[PDB]
Symmetry: D2
Subunit: 332 residues, 4 copies
Amino acid sequence: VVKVGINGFGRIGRLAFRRIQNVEGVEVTRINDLTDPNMLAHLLKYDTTQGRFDGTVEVKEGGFEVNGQFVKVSAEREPANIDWATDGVEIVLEATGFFASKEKAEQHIHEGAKKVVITAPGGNDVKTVVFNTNHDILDGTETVISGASCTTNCLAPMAKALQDNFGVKQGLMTTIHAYTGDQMILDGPHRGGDLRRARAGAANIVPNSTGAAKAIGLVIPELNGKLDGAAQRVPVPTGSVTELVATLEKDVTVEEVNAAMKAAANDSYGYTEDPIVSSDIVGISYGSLFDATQTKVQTVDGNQLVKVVSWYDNEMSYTSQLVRTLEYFAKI
Amino acid sequence: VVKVGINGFGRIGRLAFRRIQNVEGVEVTRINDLTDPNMLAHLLKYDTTQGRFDGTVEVKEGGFEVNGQFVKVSAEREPANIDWATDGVEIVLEATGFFASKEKAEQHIHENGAKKVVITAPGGNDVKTVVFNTNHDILDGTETVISGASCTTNCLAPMAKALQDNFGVKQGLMTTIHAYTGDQMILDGPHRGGDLRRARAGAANIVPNSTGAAKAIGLVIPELNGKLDGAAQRVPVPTGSVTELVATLEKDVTVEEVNAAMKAAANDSYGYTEDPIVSSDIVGISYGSLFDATQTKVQTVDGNQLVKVVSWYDNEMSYTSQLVRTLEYFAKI
Amino acid sequence: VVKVGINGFGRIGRLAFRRIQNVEGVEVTRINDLTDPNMLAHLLKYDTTQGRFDGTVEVKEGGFEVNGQFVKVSAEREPANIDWATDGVEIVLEATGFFASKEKAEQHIHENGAKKVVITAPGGNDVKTVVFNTNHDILDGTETVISGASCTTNCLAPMAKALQDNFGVKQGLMTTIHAYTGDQMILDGPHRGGDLRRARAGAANIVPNSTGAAKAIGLVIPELNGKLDGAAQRVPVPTGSVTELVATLEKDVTVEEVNAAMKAAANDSYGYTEDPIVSSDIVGISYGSLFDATQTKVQTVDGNQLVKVVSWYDNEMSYTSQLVRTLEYFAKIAKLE
Amino acid sequence: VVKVGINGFGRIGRLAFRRIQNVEGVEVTRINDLTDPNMLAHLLKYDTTQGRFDGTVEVKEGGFEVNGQFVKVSAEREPANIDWATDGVEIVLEATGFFASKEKAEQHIHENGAKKVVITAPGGNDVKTVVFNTNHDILDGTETVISGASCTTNCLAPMAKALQDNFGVKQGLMTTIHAYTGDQMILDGPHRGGDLRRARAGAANIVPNSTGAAKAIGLVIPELNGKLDGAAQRVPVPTGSVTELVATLEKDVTVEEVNAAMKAAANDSYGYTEDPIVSSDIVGISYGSLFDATQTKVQTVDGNQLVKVVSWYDNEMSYTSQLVRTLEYFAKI
């Protein structure tokens, strides 16, 4: 029974919680967010995209009581004074976004938590892990690691599969992504200065930058600098799809490509041949779901351009990955 | 030429600036906002619901150059620190929503600056609230700070008044199927105001919500004071709203009389149709309120009646048009 | 077990089918629809609003295999040519919309056919309209064809009923902030029914629309006959709706009084809540109506009162849940004509 | 001067009509549609995505009176029964989608018929495809029936030809993040064409969908025949689209070089922009395609380059604008 502690109860934090209620070896014994508990309890009970909470949530003095089981809920501002140990928390899921550094993160470790999985990007100190793609790089001596981004978790299994089977020369990625909470609901000043995220998110197709373009080299070394992309935010509250147009070190057919993805299938990387749409991936556990129906292999004058597509619930897919990385990193 | 100053370049502020461009005799010579001029310029040029700006917008030293005309853009945190006079501003449109009291608003008014102020919100105790063409005749010219009511009040006012002048209103409940607003979360998250419903994804839910238009209609129509109440259902539409009013009248009526009466009350602020229009059809209109005769109802049961009247409005542009009419009028009084 | 047959595999038929998988004494053994089987199987496995099918669906020779069970799927144009008996179907759910009359509906009831039919269309003359847990007591079992009312009525009835039984209703006006439906155009175009409002883009407008719920509510609650009337405002939500009733009562009341009464009338078809929920929170619910105590208003002005009560409902699964609950009951109270 | 007749008053037809009201020397004198005139008149006046009609529309005996001018509105099912010649119709905009072939579209050519036809869909074998400002120079003026291509083709063409004429195109793959259209279901249900993806709620999903603009780009830009292939992702926006093209070129290039080439190729049909716009900012434009320099990508990995260019476009109005540009030229040619 791996005891988890969540710091930051946003979309990712709350979904992390939910997902853990369905994973056997793991369970949350301590939550720490700055928001008013009644507010957090309501948001956990009612979710627009992920649906009602599977169970019951009742506010109590120390925290909540989820399905006849008390869960401590604190509102500590600094990792320093979060006595995770009192509740038996051995791993901490840092998802507030204010501790994206090796230093900030380590604060959770005193005696005190033992290991921390960061949601934000790593840097020199932190290793970036996309479960079932490169969690093998973890030896056990790590204290802080990153679960990478939602987009990386979708692109990795797919790109790795292209690399391992045919070898990738280079490629460009385009993600038709759902709008996120950092976009304006209506045209207004985006405190980040982004002239595009300042526009109404659910009323526009909004071009936007991506980090999974380069960061992909931190998960799949042989691809370092080989891939680049962008995104197109669209009016869907959750659910995304990644398109990778690549050039390979070997010629292929649609069937070969599709086959290789099926061969690479597991709990984190699924496979379909059903003509599905966005809504069909809301809430899945796969961090990425290859769509064989969208595969393309254009041949013109002996040269090929390969197109492979993968769907992913930018919310639950990403969360399922975080939860899998947690349970593993904790058992190391 | 009525010189206007805009404090707060948000949705209202920007649309107010836009409307003024098609109102001869009124010009905006200064905008005060804390946001980077470049961000503001961009938002004035490109608008999702109201369209591309009609003309040119350039960021120049000290402000903007819109259609060959210069507009100073300042970023003062304190109203008293805005020298509206140096730019010839005689009347300020308080559109930040941060100031809703006679005291706070009067700061604009001094010698280094403003002469008159129109706040875009319920203005407090010592402030008259005006819905153009409904009660602006109460302005004697001496007042310093006035209120232009709210977007919902401007829709409700002319409609309710027509019911009062023709039949007498005993009491009534109102429901506004309102477009979502910047006040709501784009995706489920902690709402800074603590509102558990505004905390929900605004463009993906029917969201029940309180309002005070019907409750403070007495500030516009004294005879209705305390006679009306309501709420709203926010829906996945970026702009455009409808206000339904169910009430009890003193005289018995027919669907025909209520509609005829509304039509007679029609003017530049209160429109009238019989076309089965829909919400997008009112986006950007100039009427502060548009009565819809196709949705009228007069239910008679055992001698007693319930009358249902409906009016459309662009919670953004309808309101804005009303604010400009009042600015111009108040300024010239 | 009540063996049900579905005729019309649209939103209603498919959801009735999913709901039945969670109801023990009922199962579907025959589906009849003019659509290519593969298309239907796909729409059953995947659903934009009600989610992924709970289990497995495969196209097989002559029908589907759903959760390890075979279900025959035919495409008979005429009810007369559907051997419902062959599959053990005792009760049929007529949801195609093309057999909304008693005479037309009875075509399912032949020798090698079904015994009882429940239409999803409105009823009226020789067809009783039934809103389970509100007026299913009007069924004696001898009836051949009955109606399960409309999505709107199954929401309104339990609420209006409580107001009547406890305080007495004089009159009232209803407005439903309703999700857009399949009869609306996805983009502005000629609506085949000639309706100028349903001709407009359903997911990009607040669209006024007329309902008959309030008018024919008397068919379900005789006392309220002619006492109610209403309409709707279709809004940009693929599913999930809310009904607001505004009425005058026989006696004075308080918010607590009204809410408490609604809570007292709560059961499986009529839930009660006090949480400031929102539209997406009732998508997929099995309640036929969910009273929201946070929206109640009792306005008292100069001695007179206007009472406002609001109930949420998934215009799809709530209605679907009520039909299944009516199918099962009608099937077992069933007496051979 | 040029009198146009419209057959099929759906989205394309009604927009062409509107667009022509703002085009000098072109007037619509005859409309033919099977739909009831009152429903058509209503759809012309009110439009969710393109806004209220610029003027007045009134139903009259045998037609409409638009902005004071009468227009004949008939409902003949067979093209042979439309006496276009009576109204002075010299050219016909065939948009019913039921005569997308030379011999069929030709049924419009007779005594009381027209002299030329422009179909709004891939025309067939003996029909030329035309994207104004990129290849209308192939019109000799003696053709009877021609095609204005598709909405995506009018977007992809100029951009694609700019790359060909400037650097030489090897191959490329297109992806259009497209607005949902009339052929998608508003809610999940059986799609008439058997398409399992178009059967899904188009205003509530990202919907992968096949296209043909890339595979048939050769009918407009010969050198590119068979070098391009694509697909689309329909998203929840009522109108407004953007085309992404990833290709390999004959020459090495830089971002600046590509953008500059695009700017140099700009004109009335092909726009250029460096502002970080969004889809709604594109609704209603007259460009057949608008290149966005802010989205250009030129990736260089070990000496090999992958170029990505992007163009916005209103799948409705951009394409409509192209159609009337072509209609006018063809008629005068």
